[PDB]
Amino acid sequence: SHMKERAAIIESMNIIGNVKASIQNDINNNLDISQQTYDTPTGVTVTGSTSGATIDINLSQTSPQHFTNDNDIIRLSGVVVSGSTFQWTCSHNVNASTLTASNVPHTCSSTFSA
Numbered sequence: 202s203h204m205k206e207r208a209a210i211i212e213s214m215n216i217i218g219n220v221k222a223s224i225q226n227d228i229n230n231n232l233d234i235s236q237q238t239y240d241t242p243t244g245v246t247v248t249g250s251t252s253g254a255t256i257d258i259n260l261s262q263t264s265p266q267h268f269t270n271d272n273d274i275i276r277l278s279g280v281v282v283s284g285s286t287f288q289w290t291c292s293h294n295v296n297a298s299t300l301t302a303s304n305v306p307h308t309c310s311s312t313f314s315a
Contacts, residue, residue, distance in 0.1 A: 220245065233251045235251075
């Protein structure tokens with residue numbers, strides 16, 4: 202089922218594109234992300250600080266037709282530093298999840314443990 206799972210994760214990034222944009226705009230207006238309120242879809246958690254931001258997608262909530270395990274979380278981590286333009290990195294949870302290098306898109310093969 203690794204293919205349908207990947208497809209669903211690729212599609213899930215559309216759920217958060219405007220959240221990413223909102224966060225970037227807020228950083229560009231020198232706001233602390235932790236102090237803002239974001240318009241986001243269900244199953245999504247936003248955290249951050251003055252120095253970055255994290256968006257978690259709980260796939261069992263966003264995409265229940267493909268994922269049922271509550272640890273199946275994709276994380277987008279956003280940051281700007283002097284040396285490079287604001288950039289997002291995608292990672293997947295490996296703590297008792299179903300998410301592996303095989304069933305996540307190649308852009309998300311980085312790992313974390315929730």
